């Protein structure tokens, strides 16, 4: 059925149908354009007129212009043939590698898996990152949240998680660019092309790309998240196979919607976000999960406005995660990377009956001595390092070492640190902190533990440090 445009204000366009009125969430093709322009039906304003958010620019639309109802929601190409291909928000290929000849198209809009469909299995997923696997271990097929203020390490960290877990993954992996930098898309693409996770000459490619970055109007960024999610959905169900889903900054899903709320006629809510903030995020997150049909090991990067975690956007995103790794400017500033907060990063499987008692105790043992050390930060802030009983000043000296031993060079961050990225096995991590908490390495200088791999290099470096003096 054909409709006509009757109002164009930004990403919000009103289309009037005389014939039949398209149902909400239906994709509409704007005729008369040298580039497919999709309009998603958002509301029924009444009097045979629907309001829609544009999946692209509206520069050039004319009142009265024709609009063909495609009959259904945005359907994009899914399946193995997407692997290695960079997809749009509406399924268009943007790698200049021609069309994506797929035999099945799914709607980026769909209901979330029922409750009877939920899986209760939890198997720790080892990442080689001491802090992560130590304090807040990720879990197989779980939902991973990576919080962080601007430029503290969300992007580099998620990159390490792909260089570590994705490369050695016996299966497919989806990556969705959500309102970030197109330059990062370039980087990730060509870097995946190098590592061979993406093959341009054959069919061994194991990651699918979906992008709708910053240069894109809100409408798009407001749906790409759902696009990428759909692609990974097909890999979870029509196969059951293990799927890894990386979304760089789901926060751009809520800002996108925050950038078109008003124009959709909505009183603003607290902090300017949409009133629908929490539920939009809900019908979006619940879809990114592991069901009894297959498993999704998702790692979302979450922005935190002005560094404030209490901001509605991030505060509403937590409960959607089974494991959270919070980044801290304060920490990054002390040149500690990943800038993971030891006192604010938690995980659902951080239970002694899932990781054993040894693993658990050490973790809390780390966290505690680090909390005690925060308590002395104050006391010594006025007194100086010469008042703490030999007992306290002893913990301060271990805090520093344990603090520094949480830092770790990333293979993906070579170009930054200049050192050789290391990868630590779980067991070597516990031992590592088990021994330091024991008092064993109280004769070694802190610096010895800064930016290293297993606890050994520490001693080794400590030695290379003794000889140089």
């Amino acid at each position: 059925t054909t409709g006509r445009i009757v109002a164009v204000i930004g990403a919000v366009v009103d289309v009037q149908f005389d014939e039949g009125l398209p149902p909400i969430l239906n994709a509409l093709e704007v005729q008369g354009r040298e580039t497919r322009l999709v309009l998603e039906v958002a509301q029924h304003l009444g009097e045979s007129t629907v309001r829609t958010i544009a999946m692209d620019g509206t520069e050039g639309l004319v009142r009265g212009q024709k609009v063909l109802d495609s009959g259904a929601p945005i359907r994009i190409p899914v399946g193995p043939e997407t692997l290695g291909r960079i997809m749009n928000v509406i399924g268009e290929p943007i790698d200049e590698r021609g069309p994506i000849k797929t035999k099945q198209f799914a709607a980026i809009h769909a209901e979330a898996p029922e409750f009877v469909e939920m899986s209760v299995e939890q198997e720790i997923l080892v990442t080689g990152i001491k802090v992560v696997d130590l304090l807040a271990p990720y879990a197989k097929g779980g939902k991973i949240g990576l919080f962080g203020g601007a430029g503290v390490g969300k992007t580099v960290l998620i990159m390490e998680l792909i260089n570590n877990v994705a490369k050695a993954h016996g299966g497919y992996s989806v990556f969705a660019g959500v309102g970030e930098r197109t330059r990062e898309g370039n980087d990730l693409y060509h870097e995946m092309i190098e590592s061979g996770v993406i093959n341009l000459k054959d069919a061994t490619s194991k990651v699918a790309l979906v992008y709708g970055q910053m240069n894109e109007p809100p409408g798009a960024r407001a749906r790409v998240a759902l696009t990428g999610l759909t692609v990974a959905e097909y890999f979870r169900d029509q196969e059951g196979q293990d799927v890894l889903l990386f979304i760089d900054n789901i926060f751009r899903f809520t800002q996108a919607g925050s950038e078109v709320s008003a124009l959709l006629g909505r009183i603003p809510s607290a902090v300017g976000y949409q009133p629908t903030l929490a539920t939009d995020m809900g019908t979006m997150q619940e879809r990114i999960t592991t069901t009894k049909k297959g498993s999704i090991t998702s790692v979302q990067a979450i922005y935190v406005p002005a560094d404030d975690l209490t901001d509605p956007a991030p505060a509403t995103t937590f409960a959607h995660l089974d494991a959270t790794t919070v980044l801290s400017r304060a920490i990054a500033e002390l040149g500690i990377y990943p800038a993971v907060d030891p006192l604010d990063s938690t995980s659902r499987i951080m239970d002694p009956n899932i990781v054993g008692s040894e693993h658990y105790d050490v973790a809390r043992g780390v966290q505690k001595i680090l909390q005690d050390y925060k308590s002395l930060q104050d006391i010594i802030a006025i007194l100086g390092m010469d008042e703490l009983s030999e007992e306290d000043k002893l913990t301060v000296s271990r805090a520093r070492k344990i603090q520094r031993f949480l830092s770790q060079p990333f293979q993906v961050a070579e170009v930054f640190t200049g050192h050789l990225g290391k990868l630590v096995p779980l067991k070597e991590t516990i031992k590592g902190f088990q021994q330091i908490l024991a008092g064993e390495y109280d004769h070694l200088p802190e610096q010895a533990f800064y930016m290293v791999g297993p606890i050994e290099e520490a001693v080794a470096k400590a030695d290379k440090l003794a000889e140089e003096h």
């Binding site: 925060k374 930060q377 104050d378 006025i382 000296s397 070694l444 200088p445 030695d463 003794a466």
Partner: protein, 37 residues
């Protein structure tokens, strides 16, 4: 409230200072000792 002092400036650079200064010499102090051992 654990370590509010440090989570600021004026007296934080101090705590930060004394701190590093201490462990700075100490370690050098421990450094040559490593050689001994």
């Amino acid at each position: 409230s654990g370590d509010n002092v440090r989570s600021s400036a004026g007296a934080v650079r101090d705590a930060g200072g004394a701190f590093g200064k201490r462990e700075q010499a100490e370690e050098e102090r421990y450094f040559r000792a490593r050689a001994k051992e």
